[PDB]
Amino acid sequence: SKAAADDFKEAFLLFDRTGDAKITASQVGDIARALGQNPTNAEINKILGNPSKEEMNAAAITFEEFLPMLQAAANNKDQGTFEDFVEGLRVFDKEGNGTVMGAELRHVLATLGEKMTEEEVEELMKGQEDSNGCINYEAFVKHIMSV
Amino acid sequence: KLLGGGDVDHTQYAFGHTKVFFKAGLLGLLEEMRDDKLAEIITATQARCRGFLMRVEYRAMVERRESIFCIQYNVRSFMNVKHWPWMKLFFKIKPLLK
Amino acid sequence: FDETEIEDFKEAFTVIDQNADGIIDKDDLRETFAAMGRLNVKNEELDAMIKEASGPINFTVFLTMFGEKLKGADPEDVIMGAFKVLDPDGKGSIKKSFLEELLTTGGGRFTPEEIKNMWAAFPPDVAGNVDYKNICYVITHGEDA
Amino acid sequence: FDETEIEDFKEAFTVIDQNADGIIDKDDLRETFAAMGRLNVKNEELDAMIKEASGPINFTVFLTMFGEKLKGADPEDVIMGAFKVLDPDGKGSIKKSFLEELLTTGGGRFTPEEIKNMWAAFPPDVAGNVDYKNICYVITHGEDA
């Protein structure tokens, strides 16, 4: 709305590697996340196809399409409730203390639903899981929601 | 352990000493509804993750920013230098020093 | 330029300047090469070294000439710093294909053709990205050790 | 301030005061930095060092300025004294979680956030509380050794 945030246009100049002021359709998922929006990858996929837009063939972009797609994704930020994120992992391990065994969270984050690479899974556990093999998800989900 | 994953009704089944028990066709119906309900629950929980996942990649990419350059330029030098009289000289000589 | 690296270039300047007056002339170049075993050092090699400077080779002209050729020169401790960040678990030399992918996909300086030249005198282990450390040695001091 | 530490500051005062008159002016600061390799030392850095004093930098003004910044400075032998009392059986570097718990639970100066900053340049072993001794070195003389 501007509140006209012109820093979204300045961040589009940091993600366009050619400097022509266009951003390919394959970068739009990760740049919506870097502007403070977390649409799921199936949602980013649907919307695209919904609009008869094929992410399979070469794509370019213009700021005039990327701005309204970020504004259509911005209504879905009401789905980011931290009660359900901590209660999900609280149902994932027994006893009254928030600890996932290391390999349980790593294999679930790579193979269940939207596949996260094991390189990204190791980069998200690095520091929050110590050598006991127990990830405290009270501080883990706190630090994941700090970015 | 397997059934751990899936946007499936964790109700509809039941385990025991030699096998699992599973519904169809009602309990079968239940689960299905359930299944959809996790895509929601799930699909949404996936996203953030996905999102978040890359959000850490940027923090790394960025850190890396210079350490590369350092590495980048640094090598190039050598490729140029290693063939230079003066530099070979310094090289044989670099040891006699203290 | 760290100060111990500048003191190493001051010691190399004093070993090539055998007249000890502060300016390396062509006679100093020839007598330093003859004391290293070069009895056949041509005058055209000495003239090509002097043709890289605009004036006499005093200590600051030798430092500016080496600065302009070594604009990406990195000491061994900072090269091992970056290779310890590439192998953050310690000890292991990193894979050949991991260094080829990460050089290319991050930067244009890590493009392939250049990666074939990296493997080409920096041998296998070095080239491959498995060993480590010998490449830091030869980037700070050239030729086979 | 022990007397050998004051003699070390007298020797550092004489190496920065290259006019040997007893007062370090801005020309002494710039010529000591140029003799260490700083050819690009800006005048604003020299002015910010002189802006920390109310008068000329003689030996007692340099000692009072260093006293007021080092009000918890501890020599390496007293830091190793305290770490030998934390590891009273000798030799072993103490555990990471033991130093985090004992810093917090005894004092407010040992609060966590500060413990994350301790681990952050004082590397793992140091941070963790396992090694020992390298941290005493860098607390009496900074930067990586």
UniProtKB/Swiss-Prot annotation, chain A:
Gene Ontology molecular-function annotations: calcium ion binding
Classification via Gene3D superfamilies: EF-hand
One Gene Ontology term, aspect cellular component: myosin II complex
Keyword Repeat among record annotations: yes
Keyword Cell membrane: no
Keyword line: Motor protein, Muscle protein, Myosin, Repeat
PTM comment: The N-terminus is blocked.
Signal peptide residues on this chain, from the entry's feature table: none
Domain EF-hand: 7-38, 41-76, 80-115, 115-147
Top-level taxon of the source organism: Eukaryota
PANTHER family per UniProt: MYOSIN LIGHT CHAIN 1, 3, MYOSIN LIGHT CHAIN 1_3, SKELETAL MUSCLE ISOFORM
Quaternary context: Myosin is a hexamer of 2 heavy chains and 4 light chains.
Record's protein name: Myosin light chain 3, skeletal muscle isoform
Organism expressing this protein natively: Gallus gallus
Curated annotation (Swiss-Prot), chain B:
Hinge, as annotated region: 93-95
Top-level taxon in the UniProt lineage: Eukaryota
Pros-methylhistidine modified-residue sites: 10
Residue span, IQ domain: 38-67
UniProt region (Actin-binding), positions on chain: 14-28
Subcellular location: Cytoplasm, Myofibril
Role this protein plays: Muscle contraction. Myosin is a protein that binds to F-actin and has ATPase activity that is activated by F-actin.
The protein's assembly and partners: Muscle myosin is a hexameric protein that consists of 2 heavy chain subunits (MHC), 2 alkali light chain subunits (MLC) and 2 regulatory light chain subunits (MLC-2).
Family: Belongs to the TRAFAC class myosin-kinesin ATPase superfamily. Myosin family.
Domain notes: The rodlike tail sequence is highly repetitive, showing cycles of a 28-residue repeat pattern composed of 4 heptapeptides, characteristic for alpha-helical coiled coils.
Protein name in UniProt: Myosin heavy chain, skeletal muscle, adult
Organism encoding this protein: Gallus gallus (Chicken)
Span of the entire protein shown here: 747 to 844 of 1939
Swiss-Prot record, chains C, D:
Keyword annotations of the record: Calcium, Metal-binding, Methylation, Motor protein, Muscle protein, Myosin, Phosphoprotein, Repeat
Signal sequence interval, chain numbering: none
Post-translational modification: The N-terminus is blocked. N,N,N-trimethylalanine, found in other myosin light chains would not have been detected in the N-terminal tryptic peptide in PubMed:7358336 because it would remain trimethylated and ninhydrin negative after hydrolysis.
UniProt: Ca(2+) binding residues: 17, 19, 21, 28
Keyword Repeat part of the UniProt annotation: yes
Superkingdom field: Eukaryota
Gene Ontology molecular function terms on file: calcium ion binding
GO-annotated cellular components: cytoplasm; myosin complex
Domain EF-hand, residue spans: 9-39, 74-109, 110-144
Keyword Ubl conjugation: no
GO biological process: muscle contraction; skeletal muscle tissue development
Other comment: This chain binds calcium.
Subunit relationships: Myosin is a hexamer of 2 heavy chains and 4 light chains.
Entry function: Myosin regulatory subunit that plays an essential to maintain muscle integrity during early development. Plays a role in muscle contraction.
Protein name, entry field: Myosin regulatory light chain 11
Species annotation: Gallus gallus (Chicken)
